[PDB]
């Protein structure tokens, strides 16, 4: 909260103030991913970042740290055996995938980056080896299996592994640069740093009607029934909000919020930055191959504070006091996961990520009607789990928030049971579906205790025998809970 996030994060300080003006302007909480000081020496330098071609991260030490280099030994793959080559085959496969703007060049740097860690107390620069017809600056590090070598009058890190000892990757090479790919912006050199990232985005509720057109919002005010008045925030925003564009260029946002992020990334230009796109994709959990759960989350409120969190248990309160537990906006990242069981799309991710272990599953490459009806019944799973994590519920009272946030949890569990009411399905999914039914029993329970319901979940489930309707079988779920 304020001072404790500006000192410990390691970001650029003048640009977080440049994001602060739009927060007063457009009433937005702007979440962030923590990035270190070694990368933001390059962010304050004016170099652009990578897109989403390679997925390495920023090294904790180094004059070349913060980059996505050729060899991934100088990055987050530090101390791995095959991942330092599985990552080395990742950026070399970005050559033949994103070709058209991928180059091949030594890094862009200054000569004053060798004194960056001399005042940090990290690396010890020792003996000096002579080659290239020049008094050359050999230098050591904390690891003796990799040492840097930066020239005295150039910007190249012409490093090597020590030739008297063995490489841990398995290679054998002398004093050599990093051939990091470049962003060929009009031919100007700009190699690829690990990009300044996000964690989520959350404006106020007010700017929704001022961003998306209120020509249809003048028809939801002309709606008599309150339950179907909440259908006006439902279907108008399904075709507006969740119509993403997952790419490798700017960030997975819709056209009412993708237009807003470049406004957040233009206030850095006149106050320090010269490299344009410093934020090039979305969240930490918008790594589209696997999510990365964190403890440290940075955010600037609409009023101007650098809010620092400590654990997610505080952030699960900070979601349920500011993000979802307040008159605000829940635009999140798309058995003790006490508030966040993973998404329907991550259940779709967890669908495939266990059937690649064994063949026998729920529905396969077959032609039986029961297999596609189970595919038709998992269609209602993801469609109803979407309204679990949905900010279409604060329009009415906070009772109407928590009513529909478990009404789908009742409405899914019967369809979950109807998926479980099938043939003898193999336990790569059935025992995975026992993990499905137990936590959905748990999150409805904690909600019912925080509310004043005082009913067990299993008693209420046998009350709600909903056949197909929500026009009365939400109302009989209403009339059991509300009016008290």
Curated annotation (Swiss-Prot):
Supply the enzyme class, top level: lyase
What GO biological process, any one, is recorded here? cAMP biosynthetic process
Cellular component terms, GO, for this chain's entry? catalytic complex; extracellular region; host cell cytosol
Family label: Belongs to the adenylyl cyclase class-2 family.
Q: What results from changing residue 147 to Q?
A: Decreases activity
Q: What is this protein called?
A: Calmodulin-sensitive adenylate cyclase
Q: Which UniProt keywords apply?
A: ATP-binding, Calcium, Calmodulin-binding, cAMP biosynthesis, Host cytoplasm, Lyase, Magnesium, Metal-binding, Nucleotide-binding, Plasmid, Secreted, Signal, Toxin, Virulence
The reported result of mutating residue 287 to A is: Decreases activity
| Positions of Mg(2+) binding | 195, 197, 281
Known catalysed reaction(s)? Answer: ATP = 3',5'-cyclic AMP + diphosphate
Q: What is the regulatory mechanism acting on its activity?
A: Host calmodulin is an absolute requirement for its activation. Inhibited by ethyl 5-aminopyrazolo[1,5-a]quinazoline-3-carboxylate.
Q: Record-annotated residues binding 3',5'-cyclic AMP?
A: 252, 281-283
Does the keyword S-adenosyl-L-methionine belong to this entry? no
Region (Interaction with calmodulin) location: 327-484
**Free-text domain note:** The N-terminal region contains the ATLF domain responsible for binding to the cleaved form of protective antigen (PA-63). The C-terminal region contains the calmodulin-dependent activation domain and the catalytic site. This region is composed of three globular domains: CA, CB and a helical domain connected to CA by a linker. The active site lies at the interface of CA and CB. The metal ion is coordinated by residues from CA; calmodulin probably binds in a multistep fashion first to residues in CA and then to residues present in the linker and the helical domain.
Location of the region described as Catalytic CA2 in the Swiss-Prot/TrEMBL record: 194-326
Active site located where? 55 (proton acceptor)
Supply the EC number(s): 4.6.1.1
Task: Give, from the UniProt record, the effect of changing residue 195 to N.
Answer: Great decrease in activity
Please state which portion of the whole protein this structure contains, as first and last residue out of the total length.
297 to 800 of 800
User: Which region ranges are annotated with the description Catalytic CA1?
Assistant: 1-53
Gene name of the encoded protein: cya
Phenotype upon changing residue 233 to A: Little effect on activation by calmodulin
């Amino acid at each position: 909260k304020g001072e404790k996030a500006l000192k410990a994060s390691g970001l650029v300080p003048e640009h977080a103030d440049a994001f602060k003006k739009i927060a007063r302007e457009l009433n937005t909480y702007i979440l962030f991913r923590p990035v270190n000081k070694l990368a933001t020496n390059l962010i304050k330098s004016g170099v652009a970042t990578k897109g989403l071609n390679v997925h390495g991260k920023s090294s904790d030490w180094g004059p070349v740290a913060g980059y996505i280099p050729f060899d991934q030994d100088l990055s987050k793959k530090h101390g791995q055996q095959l991942a330092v080559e599985k990552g080395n085959l990742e950026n070399k496969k970005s050559i033949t995938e994103h070709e058209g703007e991928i180059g091949k060049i030594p890094l862009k740097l200054d000569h004053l980056r060798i004194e960056e860690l001399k005042e940090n107390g990290i690396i010890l620069k020792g003996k000096k080896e002579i080659d290239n017809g020049k008094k050359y600056y050999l230098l050591e590090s904390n690891n003796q299996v990799y040492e840097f070598r930066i020239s005295d009058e150039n910007n190249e890190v012409q490093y090597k592994t020590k030739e008297g000892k063995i490489t841990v990757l398995g290679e054998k090479f002398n004093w050599r640069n990093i051939e990091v790919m470049a962003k060929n912006v009009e031919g100007v050199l700009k190699p690829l740093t690990a990009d300044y990232d996000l964690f989520a985005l959350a404006p106020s509720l007010t700017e929704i009607k001022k961003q998306i057109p209120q020509k249809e919002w003048d028809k939801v005010v002309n709606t008599p029934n309150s339950l179907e008045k909440q259908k006006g925030v439902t279907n108008l925003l399904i075709k507006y909000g969740i119509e993403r564009k997952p790419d490798s260029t700017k960030g997975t946002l819709s056209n009412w919020q993708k237009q807003m992020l470049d406004r957040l990334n233009e206030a850095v230009k006149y106050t320090g930055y010269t490299g344009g796109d410093v934020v090039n994709h979305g969240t930490e959990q918008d790594n589209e191959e696997f999510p990365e759960k964190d403890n440290e989350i940075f955010i600037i409120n609409p009023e101007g504070e650098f809010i620092l969190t400590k654990n997610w248990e505080m952030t699960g309160r900070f979601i349920e006091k500011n993000i979802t537990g307040k008159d605000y906006l829940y635009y999140f990242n798309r058995k003790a996961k006490i508030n966040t069981i993973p998404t329907s799309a991550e259940f779709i991710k967890n669908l495939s990520s266990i059937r690649r272990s064994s063949n026998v599953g729920v529905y396969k490459d077959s032609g039986d009607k029961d297999e596609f009806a189970k595919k038709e019944s998992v269609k209602k799973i993801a469609g109803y789990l979407s309204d679990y994590y949905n900010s279409a519920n604060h329009i009415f009272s906070q009772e109407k928030k928590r009513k529909i946030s478990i009404f789908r949890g009742i409405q899914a569990y019967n369809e979950i049971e109807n998926v479980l009411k099938s043939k003898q399905i193999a336990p790569e999914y059935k025992n995975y579906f026992q993990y499905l039914k137990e936590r959905i029993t748990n999150q409805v329970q904690l909600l019912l205790t925080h509310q004043k319901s005082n009913i067990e979940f299993k008693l209420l489930y046998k009350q709600l025998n909903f056949t197909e309707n929500e026009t009365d079988n939400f109302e009989v779920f209403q009339k059991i809970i509300d009016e008290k």
